[PDB]
Amino acid sequence: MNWTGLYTLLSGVNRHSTAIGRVWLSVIFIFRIMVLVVAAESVWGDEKSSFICNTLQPGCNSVCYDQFFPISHVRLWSLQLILVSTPALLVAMHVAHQQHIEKKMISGTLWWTYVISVVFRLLFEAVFMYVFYLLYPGYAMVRLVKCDVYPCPNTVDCFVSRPTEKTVFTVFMLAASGICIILNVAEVVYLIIRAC
Amino acid sequence: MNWTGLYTLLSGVNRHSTAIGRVWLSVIFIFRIMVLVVAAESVWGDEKSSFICNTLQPGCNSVCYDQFFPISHVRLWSLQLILVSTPALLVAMHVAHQQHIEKKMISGTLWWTYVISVVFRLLFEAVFMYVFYLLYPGYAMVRLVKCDVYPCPNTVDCFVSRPTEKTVFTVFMLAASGICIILNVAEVVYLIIRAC
Amino acid sequence: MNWTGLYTLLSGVNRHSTAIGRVWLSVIFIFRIMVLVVAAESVWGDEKSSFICNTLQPGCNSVCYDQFFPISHVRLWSLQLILVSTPALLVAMHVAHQQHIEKKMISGTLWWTYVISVVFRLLFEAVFMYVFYLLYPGYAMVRLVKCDVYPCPNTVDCFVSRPTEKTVFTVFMLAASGICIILNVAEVVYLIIRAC
Amino acid sequence: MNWTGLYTLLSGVNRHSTAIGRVWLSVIFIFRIMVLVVAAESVWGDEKSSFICNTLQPGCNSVCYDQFFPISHVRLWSLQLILVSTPALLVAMHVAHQQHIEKKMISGTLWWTYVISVVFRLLFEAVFMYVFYLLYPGYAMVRLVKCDVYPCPNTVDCFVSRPTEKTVFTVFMLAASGICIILNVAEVVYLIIRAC
Amino acid sequence: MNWTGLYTLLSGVNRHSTAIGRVWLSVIFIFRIMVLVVAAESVWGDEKSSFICNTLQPGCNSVCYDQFFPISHVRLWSLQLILVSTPALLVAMHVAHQQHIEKKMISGTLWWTYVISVVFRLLFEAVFMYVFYLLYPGYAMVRLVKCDVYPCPNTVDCFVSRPTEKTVFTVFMLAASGICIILNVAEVVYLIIRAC
Amino acid sequence: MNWTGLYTLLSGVNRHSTAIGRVWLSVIFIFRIMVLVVAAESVWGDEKSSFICNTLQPGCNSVCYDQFFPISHVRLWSLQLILVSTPALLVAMHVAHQQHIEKKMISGTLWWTYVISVVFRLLFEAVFMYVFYLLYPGYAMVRLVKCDVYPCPNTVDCFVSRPTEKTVFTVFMLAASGICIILNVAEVVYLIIRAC
Ligand SMILES: CCCCCCCC/C=C\CCCCCCCC(=O)O[C@@H](COC(=O)CCCCCCCCCCCCCCC)COP(=O)([O-])OCC[N+](C)(C)C
Ligand SMILES: CCCCCCCC/C=C\CCCCCCCC(=O)O[C@@H](COC(=O)CCCCCCCCCCCCCCC)COP(=O)([O-])OCC[N+](C)(C)C
Ligand SMILES: CCCCCCCC/C=C\CCCCCCCC(=O)O[C@@H](COC(=O)CCCCCCCCCCCCCCC)COP(=O)([O-])OCC[N+](C)(C)C
Ligand SMILES: CCCCCCCC/C=C\CCCCCCCC(=O)O[C@@H](COC(=O)CCCCCCCCCCCCCCC)COP(=O)([O-])OCC[N+](C)(C)C
Ligand SMILES: CCCCCCCC/C=C\CCCCCCCC(=O)O[C@@H](COC(=O)CCCCCCCCCCCCCCC)COP(=O)([O-])OCC[N+](C)(C)C
Ligand SMILES: CCCCCCCC/C=C\CCCCCCCC(=O)O[C@@H](COC(=O)CCCCCCCCCCCCCCC)COP(=O)([O-])OCC[N+](C)(C)C
Ligand SMILES: CC(C)CCC[C@@H](C)[C@H]1CC[C@H]2[C@@H]3CC=C4C[C@@H](O)CC[C@]4(C)[C@H]3CC[C@]12C
Ligand SMILES: CC(C)CCC[C@@H](C)[C@H]1CC[C@H]2[C@@H]3CC=C4C[C@@H](O)CC[C@]4(C)[C@H]3CC[C@]12C
Ligand SMILES: CC(C)CCC[C@@H](C)[C@H]1CC[C@H]2[C@@H]3CC=C4C[C@@H](O)CC[C@]4(C)[C@H]3CC[C@]12C
Ligand SMILES: CC(C)CCC[C@@H](C)[C@H]1CC[C@H]2[C@@H]3CC=C4C[C@@H](O)CC[C@]4(C)[C@H]3CC[C@]12C
Ligand SMILES: CC(C)CCC[C@@H](C)[C@H]1CC[C@H]2[C@@H]3CC=C4C[C@@H](O)CC[C@]4(C)[C@H]3CC[C@]12C
Ligand SMILES: CC(C)CCC[C@@H](C)[C@H]1CC[C@H]2[C@@H]3CC=C4C[C@@H](O)CC[C@]4(C)[C@H]3CC[C@]12C
């Protein structure tokens, strides 16, 4: 493994991306992948097993955990990464297909599809940011929550596992997503300006 | 690892597949594999260990879990992926075998076997969709289930683990399967139209 | 990794195998390996930890589990795969050795050893099918078993984990083994017919 | 894998780094990675599961663990490694991009960006050292802690897991970080002296 | 990965080994490695956690398990494999060193060192077989054991986990070791006969 | 992977090491790595979870385990391996750097740095042997220990997990370390004798 191969793999074979989406976006993507890898198994490993409520009612822990955590942060970020990386994979596959068909026997089409893929990537980033805002208002996570879902009688106190570490990693991931959004907007603006 | 090698591996050495089954089907397959990888161990890891029923009867948890989950969603999707990818593997092996035998010493046969493999892939997709509909009517998963299987006395309340996250991943996987079905039908129609 | 390398590795360097044992047997072997990988850790992971009996007698769970599951299905299938793949490994090593010794300085010997290896593979398949029939009569697995082994007093009710999913995977593996047996018999018959 | 490839990968393709940041910094980075790998899963694997307090109050263990360990040492060191390695990754990607753009169709710019990246690496090292000092004053870790956080009544005695082994690994990691800081300062001074 | 590379790696670069130690010994070594891999984590994974004794005395389970299992079968077989494979590694390293020193600037020495390594391998096999016989007389493993070690009062009944599956794997490993011993003796005899 | 590449990687590109540190030291290093890999997860996996004391005092198990095992044998051996392998890594990186700088545009310096690295390796081996002697006097490990650390009242009996298997692996690792020390001393003596 060399740098001239890793850089080519990350950037794809596309020849229209500038240094914003070729040197900086790949680094932020690697940063997000590494943070998700080092945080998924350890911090969020025992989010449900150590989630306890102050009650004797059977089945209250599971219903309260599902009520307060419809989908954990780790899985939300994994889905966000997959959806954000899908258009880049599509562009790389399209470039490879065009190269194959021209070998066995265009610039504007590649430029347009790259612009469309960057727009879709920005849209996915914004959609996942909005979903995270809807599900979990506020970056901070609290230690104690009040759960009144059936079958729990009245309201019970349930305790979250590692609120502070999860808050730190949430801040990191949200900052990375914001940087990605800014870089995508800058890339779109730069391409439009240079094309005109 | 380069893009011109990954694309060749995903598309095989077949020269009859169009851009529908060469650029889009491979991307959807990668998407399904990644979602299954990020959801199998985490979301469905403790589906049975944290499945509890409100009873003192020994052995009621296991019989109720088997009654309500004959085969978990993760294993159903893994089997679906294996069966769907089997015809592509067969086509790739047949192409390699034909290349080997012509090297040590046809187009219509390859075209027909590719069409048959795509038809079988579509059939497997439809069969697994129908099986999922039969076993689990409705995408949504409920928190509480009523289990009256022996040895549980009368009817007991059993609680499912992470209904909402499993519902989200079920929606994702079903949408991906539907997209695969549509793409396979489009590929078959395109091949038939172009052949005539 | 390319297709022309994977196909060569799976088929070996043998030049006597026809398309039955070169295109179809390898695919079925890959199918069995993938099914075993996706079923070994998940379905059979907690076969003993969640095996409970309705008694207060210490040590009854372990003796009952050993009585009813002398060797689990996953380990039986792993041993079957290893024993079935051993003759192919022997043939590949013999071909490599012959190539090496002819390089540093025959067809009938290779043909005979390939026929013998296919016969041994068929014999191993049949032996493991018969062993599975002896140990576990019937593909279906029951939820409740009656265990009267010492030290359990009288007869106790013990509950198996995931009978239905294990039944489904047993059906899959038995069908794959039967297909392998049929393909091996067809390969032997084809070789004998073509040699005469 | 050979030495001339591993050395090139670790040093990047940059031609301005001297032997301080090319022979010694890479070795210390490998040392830190290996220590973190051998200490993360074993020593810090059960930091929360075996963290017990001398009370009957539900939820006191989790709140006390979060109070005394806002973010564990392993995750702090992983984040420190990622942030420290980010500027080197940026420099390598920039060098690859410059090589690509000069191939498809400068020294001062590379020198300045390398100096800036080394300065940022030193700044990140210092910031993480200061954060570790703020969160955990003193290298030594105590066996018993006094926790008076809600809902724990009055003050409870909580017991930390493996204080001595964690102290040893903390000493190792802090010494490695100090060596990295000294090497970065020496590299900056050497570059400035040689440039003038 | 091809067959001509795997065969060369398994056989080393030694030019004195015949087909007994080049085609058959490597296959048996691969068989032993695969069986150990598929049996180490599953069958022997919970040998101590599910080892229970019929007593209320604290610490009796651990002392009884250590009394009856001084070193588990899996670790004994792993050590046996490592010690048996050490002389082959030494021979390969010596051949590589001789090739390097002759490149930068004998047959009898290589023949003698290969014979000595085969003798040492046979000696290690015999020693480990004798150790296994001393520690565990008889291939069969019993469900119930009588433990009278301090602090257990009088004699307690302790129950072993999966006696039958462990017996099956013990039979497999002992048969493989016996085959290895026979092949090593045959190789030594063949070399001595051909040398004279 | 071939032997001529593995041997080159293990020996580095250094041209001053004799057969003692090129054929035998690498084999012993591989032996130690393999033993540590096969013993770390299995034997020492549950050293603390199954460490129980005969008392009702909360938190006595953790304090007693930390008192009697300040740092486990596995982590001590891992740190010893890392520290022993550090000078070899430094020498390899220095050789690669010298090759790079001579390519883009000495024997005594390489000889001296190799001698210094071997001396440092011997010093690290001796230091870790002395540390192991200080922490754990005697190779044998006892089943029962007497713990009188706060908060345990008076003196309690605590039971160690797998004393005999840990004793066996301790003997193996200590013998390997002694062999490494002897080989390093022999290498230093041989180099000094041949240089004069
Ligand atoms: C389904 C699960 C997915 C999970 C998410 C994965 C996401 C991220 C994962 C992966 C992204 C890729 C990472 C490495 C990229 C570098 C490639 C490279 O430099 O290639 C170059 C060198 O490389 C080689 O010659 C060897 C290539 C080895 C790549 C890694 C192999 C698999 C790693 C498995 C890891 C297992 C652990 C992974 C997790 C279990 C190409 O060779 P070259 O000589 O340059 O070519 C000719 C030269 N010329 C072009 C000038 C003519
Ligand atoms: C049984 C369990 C199965 C599980 C499901 C697996 C399903 C998915 C898994 C795998 C699908 C394949 C993934 C990688 C595909 C890219 C290949 C590629 O680009 O090859 C190219 C580069 O590549 C190389 O030179 C190195 C090839 C490394 C591939 C990965 C090695 C194993 C990874 C193990 C991962 C471990 C973790 C996996 C999970 C434990 C080919 O080389 P080239 O130089 O281009 O060729 C000559 C050039 N010319 C042709 C122009 C003349
Ligand atoms: C002990 C445990 C065993 C478990 C059961 C294993 C059973 C199944 C496992 C393995 C079976 C083999 C799988 C891959 C086969 C494809 C090989 C191939 O295509 O080679 C080709 C390309 O390939 C390369 O250049 C790179 C080869 C990488 C192969 C994978 C590396 C290890 C994966 C580790 C995975 C880790 C996870 C595994 C589980 C932990 C050969 O190269 P080429 O350029 O074509 O050659 C020259 C070209 N010419 C010939 C035309 C002149
Ligand atoms: C997302 C998770 C990240 C975790 C943190 C990772 C951080 C650290 C990880 C990785 C850093 C890299 C480690 C190896 C670097 C050596 C490369 C090398 O020497 O290349 C050379 C040889 O190499 C080859 O030909 C094969 C390259 C294989 C590299 C490893 C493959 C993936 C390993 C997966 C590991 C799985 C386990 C990992 C953990 C799951 C290049 O080839 P060459 O012939 O020299 O080139 C032509 C020669 N010429 C230039 C003179 C013309
Ligand atoms: C410390 C833990 C140890 C555990 C015990 C291990 C014991 C057993 C383990 C390993 C034994 C070796 C297994 C593979 C051997 C095949 C090699 C081969 O065919 O090479 C050939 C092809 O190969 C390649 O080009 C790629 C080589 C990839 C080998 C696997 C990489 C690492 C797998 C990691 C696995 C991860 C999972 C492992 C467990 C975590 C050589 O190339 P070639 O083109 O033929 O050369 C030039 C051609 N010419 C010579 C004609 C001129
Ligand atoms: C951070 C965690 C660290 C843990 C401790 C690690 C310590 C030990 C680990 C690693 C030490 C190295 C082991 C293999 C060494 C053999 C290399 C070799 O023979 O190269 C040769 C062949 O090789 C190839 O062509 C492929 C190289 C694959 C090496 C393994 C890849 C990553 C394995 C990942 C394993 C995953 C599991 C690991 C654990 C998760 C070089 O190629 P060549 O064709 O000879 O070169 C040209 C020929 N010529 C020179 C004559 C011109
Ligand atoms: C500018 C940024 C966003 C570019 C990022 C490139 C991403 C999207 C690309 C680069 C290399 C790609 C990987 C290359 C190879 C494989 C192996 C295959 O079996 C599954 C997909 C997977 C794992 C790809 C996923 C997508 C991937 C990570
Ligand atoms: C158009 C779409 C459906 C094409 C998808 C291609 C799929 C079916 C192919 C492409 C590469 C293939 C893999 C290549 C190599 C191996 C290693 C082998 O030991 C097991 C099978 C396995 C893991 C193959 C499984 C099938 C596979 C994933
Ligand atoms: C026609 C069908 C049955 C052919 C199947 C081929 C099988 C038997 C062959 C093809 C490739 C082989 C593998 C190639 C390389 C290795 C790595 C080695 O360290 C252990 C054995 C192992 C894992 C081999 C096991 C046997 C294997 C899987
Ligand atoms: C002077 C010192 C600091 C140099 C250290 C070099 C570091 C920063 C470089 C060298 C090789 C790099 C790795 C090379 C390849 C990959 C695979 C990719 O999928 C994720 C990033 C990752 C894992 C890189 C991370 C950063 C890395 C480890
Ligand atoms: C005739 C029979 C006994 C020959 C068997 C060959 C054995 C002893 C050889 C062949 C290939 C070798 C392996 C090749 C590469 C490595 C990687 C290295 O980092 C650790 C050692 C290890 C894992 C070797 C161990 C010994 C090994 C498995
Ligand atoms: C004579 C004896 C002591 C020589 C032993 C050589 C040792 C020290 C060398 C040989 C090959 C080296 C490895 C080669 C590649 C890597 C990958 C890198 O990402 C981390 C370091 C690591 C894992 C190296 C560690 C040190 C290493 C194992």
* DSSP reduced 3-state for A147: strand
Q: Do C7 and B93 touch (CB under 8 A)?
A: yes
Resolution of this model in Å is 3.2
**Residue F37 in contact with partner chain D when CB distance is under 8 A:** no
* DSSP reduced 3-state for A52: strand
CB B39 within 8 A of CB A76: no
How many Å separate Cα F170 from the centre of its chain?
11
F196 min Cα distance to partner chain D (Å): 30
Q: How far is CA E140 from CA B85, C65, E168, in A?
A: 44, 17, 8
User: Is residue E30 lining ligand 3, measured as CB closer than 6 Å?
Assistant: no
- Chain D, nearest residue to A32 by Cα: D82
Q: How far is CA B170 from CA A48, B72, B176, in A?
A: 20, 11, 10
Nearest CA to E94 out of F10, A116, B37 is that of F10
Name the residue with the closest Cα to ligand 5, atom 52: E5
CB atoms within 10 A of CB B108: 7
DSSP string, D124-191: HHHHHHHHHHHHS-SS---SEEEE--TTS-S-EEEE-S-HHHHHHHHHHHHHHHHHHHHHHHHHHHHH
Give the C-alpha separation, D73 to A162, whole Å: 14
Cis amide prior to E163 (ω within 30 degrees)? no
User: Is residue C10 lining ligand 9, measured as CB closer than 6 Å?
Assistant: yes
Q: Do B39 and A75 touch (CB under 8 A)?
A: yes
B62 min Cα distance to partner chain C (Å): 6
Give the C-alpha separation, D32 to D175, whole Å: 10
CB C35 within 8 A of CB C144: no
Tokens standing for E32? 């032993």
Q: What is the CA radius of gyration of chain F?
A: 21
User: Which of ligand 9's atoms lies nearest the C-alpha of C121?
Assistant: 3
Give the C-alpha separation, E142 to E164, whole Å: 8
Task: Mark which residues 166-195 of D lie under 8 Å from A by CB.
Answer: none
Give the C-alpha separation, B38 to B45, whole Å: 11
Tokens standing for D54? 């001398």
The one-letter amino acid code at B23 reads V
Give the C-alpha separation, C143 to C158, whole Å: 8
Q: Do B27 and A86 touch (CB under 8 A)?
A: yes
Tokens standing for D35? 């220590």
Give the C-alpha separation, B90 to B114, whole Å: 10
DSSP string, F107-168: HHHHHHHHHHHHHHHHHHHHHHHHHHHHHS-SS---SEEEE--TTS-S-EEEE-S-HHHHHH
Give the C-alpha separation, A89 to F74, whole Å: 43
User: Is residue B27 lining ligand 7, measured as CB closer than 6 Å?
Assistant: no
Give the C-alpha separation, A188 to B16, whole Å: 36
Q: How far is CA E80 from CA B47, D140, E140, in A?
A: 39, 42, 20
Q: Do C54 and B49 touch (CB under 8 A)?
A: no
CA of A31 to the centre of ligand 7 (A): 14
**Residue A110 in contact with partner chain B when CB distance is under 8 A:** no
D9 min Cα distance to partner chain A (Å): 6
Sign of the C-alpha dihedral computed for residues C141, C144, C146 and C152 taken in this order: positive
How do beta strands A156-159 and D52-53 pair? Answer: unpaired
> Closest ligand to B121 CA?
8
Resolved by = cryo-EM
Give the C-alpha separation, D6 to B55, whole Å: 60
Last residue before each gap in chain B (C to N over 2.5 A): 105
Tally the C-alpha atoms within 13 A of residue A136's C-alpha that lie toward its C-beta: 20
CB B32 within 8 A of CB B173: yes
The angle at the Cα of F13, spanning F188 to E108, to the nearest 5 degrees, equals 75
* DSSP reduced 3-state for E81: helix
**Residue E9 in contact with partner chain C when CB distance is under 8 A:** no
Which residues make Cβ contacts (< 8 Å) with residue A100, sequence separation at least 6? B4, B7, B8
CB C173 within 8 A of CB C35: yes
Tokens standing for C141? 């697995």
**Residue B64 in contact with partner chain C when CB distance is under 8 A:** no
CA of C6 to the centre of ligand 3 (A): 7
Angle between helices D25-40 and D163-195 (to 10 degrees): 160
B105: exposed, middle or buried (Cβ count in 10 Å: 0-12, 13-18, 19+): exposed
Give the C-alpha separation, B92 to B10, whole Å: 10
Q: Which chains touch A (3 or more CB pairs under 8 A)?
A: B, D
The one-letter amino acid code at D118 reads V
User: Is residue A87 lining ligand 7, measured as CB closer than 6 Å?
Assistant: no
CB C45 within 8 A of CB E45: no
Q: For an interface test with C, give the residue of B17, B64, B93, B136 to mutate (most C CBs within 10 A).
A: B93
Name the residue with the closest Cα to ligand 8, atom 24: B89
Rounded to 5 degrees, φ, ψ at B145 are: -130, 150
